[PDB]
Structure formats: structure tokens, C-alpha cells
């Protein structure tokens, strides 16, 4: 849906090429979706979130946020 | 006023922190740490120490004038002849 019309599709193009060097076409995005699978996001998942330092920033009425040790800890689980 | 959401009213302040696992637990220790705690000793020394030391003078004193007294008297003997 977001290729629909002709400017979402040229700045995909240059978009592209600055970082591939090559417009990837469609049918290959659909052939590498149908590679996903459920173990396939576990594993991808616990590769890059689990138990990890995350960055945080808050701009508001924000008293009641918890301290960073809080939200580590929230970052895995101990039934695990 | 006893719950995180609602206790004080602040505006204009902003925080840096860092995670624990990305600094030491031990930062200047040697260069930074002990002056710091010199400085504590120093800073609170004469408040508090020369009490002490009267205590301890009080102490000895006492001690010394106890046994003092149980020494036999050669003023209670001279004449008792
Ligand atoms: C022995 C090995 C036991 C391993 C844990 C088995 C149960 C795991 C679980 O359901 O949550 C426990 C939960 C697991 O750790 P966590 O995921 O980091 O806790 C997140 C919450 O903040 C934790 O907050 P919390 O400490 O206040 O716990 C509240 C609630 C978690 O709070 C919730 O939101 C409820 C979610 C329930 C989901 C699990 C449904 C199980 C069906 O956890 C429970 O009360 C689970 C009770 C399960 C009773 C099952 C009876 C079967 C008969 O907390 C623990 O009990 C620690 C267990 C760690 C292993 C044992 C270590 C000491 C030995
Ligand atoms: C290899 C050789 C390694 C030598 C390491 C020496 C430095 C040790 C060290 O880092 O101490 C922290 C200390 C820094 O302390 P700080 O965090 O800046 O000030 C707060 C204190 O830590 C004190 O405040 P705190 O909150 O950090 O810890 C206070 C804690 C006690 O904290 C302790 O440090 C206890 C001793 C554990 C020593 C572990 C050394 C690990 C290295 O006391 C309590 O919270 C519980 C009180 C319960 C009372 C129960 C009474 C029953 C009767 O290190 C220093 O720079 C001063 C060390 C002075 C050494 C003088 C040597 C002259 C030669």
C-alpha cells in the first residue's frame, strides 16, 4: 500500500540505492516473508531484546516513571 | 502525596544516568574515593574526638584514685607504735 502512486515509489528508488545499490523488487520480499516462521521471530527476538540495556527518555509529568534498574530488571523474565 | 504519580510539583530539571553494566562499580577509588573520606574524618574531627579524650582522662584518673585509696597508710602507723 505505501508504493501506491508515483512519489512513494521514486524516493523508494533513491532511497534504495543509496543503501543497497539495487531497487530489491517485490516478488523477493514476498519470498523472504514466507521464510518467517515462529521459531524463526523467537530466536531473532531473543537474539536482539532479551535481556538487553535499553535507552530511555522521557519528556512530561513524569514522576512515576521507574528508576532504570526497574525497567532492566521488566527486560527478562525468571519463569524463563 | 504517598503514591509516585502525585507527590511534588517540579519543572526545568533534566537527569543524565547511565546503565549499570556500562560503568564500573569501582570508579577512582584510589585517586578520587579516599580524599573524599579524608576530608569527611577532617571536616568532623574536633566536634566530636576531644569529648572522648576527657572520658578516657575521667577513666584513667578514677582507676588511678581507687587503687590509691587500698594503699595502707604510714600516717595511720607512725604513732600506733
Ligand atoms: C520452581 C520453579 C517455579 C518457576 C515459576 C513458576 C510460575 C511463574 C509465574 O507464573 O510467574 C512467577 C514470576 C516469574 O518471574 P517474572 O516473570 O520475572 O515476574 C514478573 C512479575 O513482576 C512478578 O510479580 P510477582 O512476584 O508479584 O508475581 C505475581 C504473578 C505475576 O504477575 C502477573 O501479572 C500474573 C501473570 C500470570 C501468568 C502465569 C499464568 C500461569 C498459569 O506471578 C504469580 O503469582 C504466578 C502464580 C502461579 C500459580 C500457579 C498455580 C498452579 C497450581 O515471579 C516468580 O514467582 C519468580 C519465579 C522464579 C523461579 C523460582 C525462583 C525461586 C525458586
Ligand atoms: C586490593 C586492596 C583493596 C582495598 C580496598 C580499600 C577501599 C574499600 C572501599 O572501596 O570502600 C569504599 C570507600 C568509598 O566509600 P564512599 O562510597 O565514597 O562513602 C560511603 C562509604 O562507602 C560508606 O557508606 P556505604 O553506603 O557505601 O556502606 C555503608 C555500610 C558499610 O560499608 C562497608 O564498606 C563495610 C566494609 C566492606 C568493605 C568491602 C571492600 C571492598 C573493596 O554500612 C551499612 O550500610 C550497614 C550498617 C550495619 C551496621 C551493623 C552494626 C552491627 C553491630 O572506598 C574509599 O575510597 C575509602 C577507603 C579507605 C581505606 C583507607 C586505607 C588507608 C591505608
Given at each position: 500500500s505505501?508504493?501506491?502512486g508515483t512519489t512513494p515509489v521514486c524516493e523508494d528508488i533513491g532511497r534504495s540505492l543509496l543503501t543497497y545499490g539495487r531497487r530489491?523488487?517485490?516478488?523477493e520480499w514476498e519470498s523472504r516473508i514466507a521464510e518467517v516462521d515462529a521459531s524463526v521471530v523467537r530466536e531473532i527476538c531473543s537474539k536482539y531484546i532479551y535481556d538487553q540495556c535499553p535507552a530511555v527518555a522521557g519528556y512530561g509529568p513524569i514522576e512515576?516513571?521507574?528508576d532504570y534498574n526497574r525497567i532492566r530488571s521488566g527486560m527478562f523474565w525468571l519463569r524463563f | 502525596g504517598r503514591e509516585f504519580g502525585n507527590l511534588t510539583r517540579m519543572r526545568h530539571?533534566?537527569?543524565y544516568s547511565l546503565s549499570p553494566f556500562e560503568q564500573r562499580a569501582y570508579p577512582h577509588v584510589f585517586t578520587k574515593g579516599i580524599p573524599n573520606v579524608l576530608r569527611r574524618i577532617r571536616e568532623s574531627?574536633?566536634?566530636?574526638?576531644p569529648q572522648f579524650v576527657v572520658f578516657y582522662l575521667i577513666y584513667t584518673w578514677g582507676t588511678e584514685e581507687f587503687e590509691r585509696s587500698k594503699r595502707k597508710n604510714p600516717a595511720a602507723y607512725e604513732n600506733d607504735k
Open positions: 505505501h508504493l501506491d530489491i523488487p517485490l516478488a512515576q516513571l521507574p | 530539571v533534566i537527569s574531627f574536633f566536634r566530636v574526638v
